C-alpha cells in the first residue's frame, strides 16, 4: 500500500491510496450518513452531530470496516499494512478514549474536522486490537491528511507514535523514521535536465530527460516505493482545478503501482495494486479505479442522502 496527499492553491484536500495485495473481493464504495447510529466497540466518545463519511470498505456486523475513508469537511484516513512493526494491547485502558483498530478509520472520519483535532485527541487514545481465534490479527499503521498536512500513526510495542508527515506519503515497513532518514540518500536526485559536465577530458551529456533522476530505486519493495512516491509527490507541479488534481493523484499513485509478475509475496503469489482510491474535499467526491479497469469512477457525497440512517454500498 501507498498513501499520498497534497493540496491545491485554495487549501483543498487531495488524498488517496493504492491497495496492494494478491487478491481482494467484496470491498465497495461504502457511504456512512450522518443519521446512522454508530455504537463504538469500547464506548469511545463521539460528537453530538457526526460528519458524513464516504470511503472504500466492507460491512461486517452492521459496521463499515473502511480500508480508507474521508468526511465532508476534508479529513481522510487510510490504513496500510504494517506487520512486524504494528503491535497493540487487547484490553481497553481505563479513562482513555479506547478505539478498536478496525473502527479507527470510521471513528476519525466521523468525529474530527482536521488533523489538528485528531492529533490533539490521540494523546489520550488507546488503539485496541481484539483477537478472534483462527482469524488473522489486522496489523496496520495509518496515514491521516486534511487540506494542510498529514500525520502517520504507528502503534507499536513501545507505544504510540504520531509523526508529522512532511513528505505527505506513507507505504509499509519499517518505521516512519527509517523512511525519513533513507530519503537523505536520494538528496541529489533531481528533476532538472542534467547539465553537461566533464570527467577529465571526457565530456558527458544526458541522452534526454530523466538522467538527473538517476539514483531513484525502481523496485516495488516498501522502502523503494516510499522514496519513489515521496519524490514524485514533491516534484509534481501545483495544480488548480478538480480534474488536473485528480489526474495528479492517480498518476502519482501510479508511479509506485505493483504490476503482475513483478514481486511475489511470502506465499509465492504476485502482489498487485488491486485498486486505487482517492478523495477531493473540493467536491466532496471519492474516486476509484482497479487493476482490471483504469477508468476513474466518481462517487459524489452530494449524490447520497446524508441524513439517512443506513450504510450504503455501490458497484460494481
Amino acid at each position: 500500500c501507498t498513501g499520498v496527499r497534497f493540496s491545491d492553491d485554495e487549501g483543498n484536500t487531495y488524498f488517496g491510496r493504492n491497495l496492494d495485495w494478491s487478491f481482494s473481493y467484496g470491498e465497495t464504495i461504502l457511504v456512512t450518513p450522518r443519521g446512522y447510529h454508530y455504537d463504538t466497540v469500547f464506548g469511545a466518545g463521539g460528537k453530538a452531530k457526526p460528519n458524513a463519511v464516504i470511503g472504500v470498505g466492507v460491512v461486517m456486523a452492521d459496521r463499515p470496516m473502511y480500508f480508507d475513508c474521508a468526511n465532508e469537511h476534508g479529513l481522510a484516513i487510510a490504513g496500510l499494512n504494517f506487520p512486524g512493526y504494528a503491535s497493540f494491547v487487547h484490553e481497553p485502558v481505563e479513562g482513555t478514549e479506547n478505539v478498536a483498530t478496525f473502527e479507527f478509520p470510521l471513528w476519525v472520519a466521523r468525529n474530527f474536522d482536521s488533523v489538528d483535532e485528531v492529533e490533539e485527541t490521540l494523546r489520550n487514545v488507546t488503539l485496541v486490537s481484539q483477537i478472534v481465534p483462527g482469524q488473522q490479527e489486522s496489523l496496520l499503521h495509518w496515514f491521516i491528511g486534511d487540506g494542510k498536512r498529514s500525520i502517520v500513526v504507528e502503534q507499536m510495542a513501545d507505544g504510540m507514535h504520531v509523526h508529522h508527515d512532511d513528505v505527505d506519503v506513507l507505504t509499509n515497513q519499517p518505521t516512519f523514521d527509517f523512511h525519513m532518514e533513507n530519503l537523505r540518500n536520494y538528496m541529489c536526485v533531481s528533476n532538472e535536465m542534467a547539465e553537461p559536465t566533464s570527467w577529465g577530458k571526457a565530456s558527458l551529456t544526458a541522452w534526454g530527460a530523466g538522467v538527473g533522476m538517476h539514483g531513484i530505486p525502481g523496485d516495488v519493495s516498501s522502502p523503494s516505493r516510499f522514496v519513489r512516491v515521496a519524490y514524485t509527490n514533491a516534484h509534481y507541479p501545483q495544480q488548480n482545478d478538480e480534474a488536473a488534481n485528480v489526474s495528479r493523484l492517480f498518476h502519482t499513485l501510479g508511479s509506485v503501482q505493483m504490476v503482475d509478475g513483478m514481486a511475489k509475496m511470502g506465499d509465492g503469489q504476485f502482489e498487485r495494486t488491486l485498486f486505487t482510491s482517492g478523495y477531493s474535499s473540493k467536491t466532496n467526491t471519492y474516486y476509484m479505479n482497479t487493476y482490471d479497469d483504469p477508468a476513474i469512477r466518481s462517487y459524489a457525497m452530494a449524490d447520497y442522502d446524508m441524513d439517512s440512517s443506513e450504510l450504503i454500498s455501490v458497484a460494481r
Copy 2:
C-alpha cells in the same frame, strides 16, 4: 517513448507504446482502408491488395503520418524518438525500395504480413529523410512486432541495423546493443520472495514483497526505462483472454510512464506520457488512453468499412 509486445497462448499479437513528450495535439485514431489510394513518395513497391490499417497519427497532405499503427493480419510498427543516433540519406538510391521515414509505418503495415517478410525486404530498403527548411528533421528508430517476435530498425550514419529483439521492448537512446548489454547488470534482480539469509551472525529477511527486485533503476531516463519495462514484460505471467491481455499491455507500459514533475527536457519542460496506444490481433482492435484520462477506449477494425477509399479520423 516505450514499445512493448508479447503474445498469448494462441499466437496473437499484443503490441503498444507510450508517447512521451512535453505536449501533443491533433493526433487521433486514424483508419486507412484497403481501397485508399496510396502514392509512395519515392515510388516504392506495394502489394496488389493492400492490408487494412489502423493506428494513431495525423494527416498531412492526404497521407497518414502514423506514430504507430497495425494491420488486419497482426503486424504492428511504432516509431520512437532517436536523435543523436538516427541518421539518414536525403536522396533515393537507385534500384532499392526507397521509403520516406515519415511513411515507413504505413508502408510496413500496408504491404507486409509478418516480421519475416519485413525483415526480408528491409535488406533492400533505403530509408530516406527529406529536409524541409526550418522544420525539424524527424529522427526515429522503429519497433516492429507480430504474433511471434519483434525487430528494431536503427538507421544510422554507418548503415541500417535490424536487430532481433529478444526482450520485446524498445525505448530511446543509445543503440539497441547498449541496452542489451546493460541488462546483464540486472541479471540477479528477481521476482521471487527474497530468501532469508545471513551476513555473519546477522540474520536478514525481506520486509515483504519486492526486495528481490531491488536493483532495478526507477528513473525515467531512456536506458532505465529499457531495463524496467524489459524486466516487467519478461516476468508478467502469460494471459489468455482479450481483457487480461489488454490489461497486461497497459500495466506494463504503465510501469515506465512519465509523470509530470519527474523530468525536464532540454527545454525545461516536463516530459510526460501524453498517451498510450495498443493493438490486439486477436480482435483487430486498437486501444488508447491519455495522460488526462486513463479510461481505455477501443477502436475495432470491424467498425469501419475497410473497402472505402477515404482516411478516417475519430475522437476526441
Copy 3:
C-alpha cells in the same frame, strides 16, 4: 570511519578501523603502561591491577586520548564520529560510574577483559562530555570487540543504547538500528558467479566475476560504507594465521577507504582515510598504515616496558 571485527578459528581478536578526516591532529602510536598513574576526570572506579594498553591517539594535559586502543587481553575499542545523533550530559550522576567521553577508550581498555564485562558495567555508566570554551563537543559512538563479539554504544538525547553488533562493523550516522534495517535492502547481493537466466527470449550471462554483487553502493557516505564493509566482512573467508588475518583486516577496511577527491566535507576539504589501524590478540600487536604510505608497521606490546609509568609515543 569504519570499524571492523572478526575472529580466527582459535578465538583471537582482529579489530581495526579507518580514520577518515581532512587533516591529521598529530596522532601517534601510544602505549599506556600498567604503572601509569591515571586520575579519572569524574572519579570513575578503576581496577587495582590495570591492563596494559596500546592504541592510536594524542596527548593533552598529561592524558592519553585514544582514537582506538586495545588491551593485553584482547579487548579493543574505537570511537567514531557521530554528530547529529550523539548527545551527552555535562555533569556526573551520583552512584553511577561517571566516565568522560575522551577517556572512555582508555577507561574501557584498562579495566575490562571482555565484551561481557564492558556490557555489564555499561548498565551503570554515565558518559559525560566536558564543555571546553569555543571548541565543539566531540560527539562519538563506540565500537567495542573481543575474540567473540562486538557491541556498539550510542549515547543519544534519549539515553544510552547498547547494541549487539551482529555484522561486526560500524560506520557513522544515522543510528545503528537504521543501518541494520538498511542491510535488508541488499539481502540478495551474492558473491556467487551469477547464473545464466532468461528474460523472455533474451539469455543473460555475466561478463565475469562481480555481477552477483551488483546492488552494493559505491559512494563513501556513511550508510553506503556501512553496507559495503558489512558485505565484505561477512563474506571474507576465515583465516587461521597471523599474516593472513592482518591482511584480511586491511583489505576489508580498504574496501571502504576515502580517496582524495571523492567527497568534500562541510569545510570544503576532501575527507580521506588518514590512517588505518588494527590489533591482533594472537600476538598483542597494533598495526598501522597511513594515507601517505600503505606499508603496514607493527608495534608489539612485548617491545614496551609494560610495568613502566610514563606513557610513550612513537613515529618516523
Copy 4:
C-alpha cells in the same frame, strides 16, 4: 583488471594497473635490456636502437611475456582480460607488421616513444594469436599511455578498434563504447557536499561527506569498476611531486580492488587483486605491491645495466 593513467603538471607519465585473478602465474618484475636480442614471432619490424624496458611478467621460451611494461621514454602498456569480445586471426597478413598477442606489450614498448607513434603504426599492425594445443587463447584488449594521453586497442571479430581514452581508465568487458555511454548514467554524481534541499516540507541534508557521490556502483563487476575508477581518477586533485603521484596511482587503483570473498569467477574461486603495479616517467621507476603485502616496492631503471643482453627477474 583496471588500468589507469594521469599526469603531473610537468607532463610525466603515471600509469598503473591491477591484476585481478584467482591464483598467481609466478609473475615477477622483469627488465628487458637494450642489448637483449629479440626475434619477433612473425617478423614484425623493430627499430635499430631499442628502448630499455621494465614491467611485470613471466619468462616462456626465452621470451619476456609482459602483463604490463613501460619504456625509458614514458610510454607504457597493459594487457587486460577481454574474453567474449577479443578475437584474432591466426596467420600473418602480407605487408602489415604482424605482432603476436603475447609479444605486443614488449613490442610497443621497445619500439615507440609516444602514444602518437603507436597510434600511427597501429594502422598497419596485424595482431595474431597463436593456437597452442589444448590451452586457450589469451584474449586481451590493451591500455596504452604516455605523459599526454591514453588509447585503447580492441581487436574484435570485426577489426581493430583504436579509441582515444578520454577518461584515462580501462577495465574488462564489454566494449569501450559501451563503457563511455554508460558513464552518462552517472553524470550527476558529485564530489561536492550535498546541499540542503527540500521535498515538499521535508528538509533533506547529508549526514556528512559522500552523499553527493551516491549513485556510483560498488560491486566489482567490470562495468561498475569502470565507472568507479573513472570517477575517482577524474576527480583526484593534480599532484606535482613523485611521492604524492605514486600515492595517487595506488589509491586510485585501490578504489576498485577485488577483496577475497567478494566475487567468485567461473571456476568457483574468489577473484582478487593479486598485485598492483605502476610506473613513473619523472623517474623511470616501476612500483608494485601485492595482495599479501601492501608495501610499495620500487625498481628504478637506473639500477639495472641497461646495455646488458640477458633479461632479469627479481623478488623476495
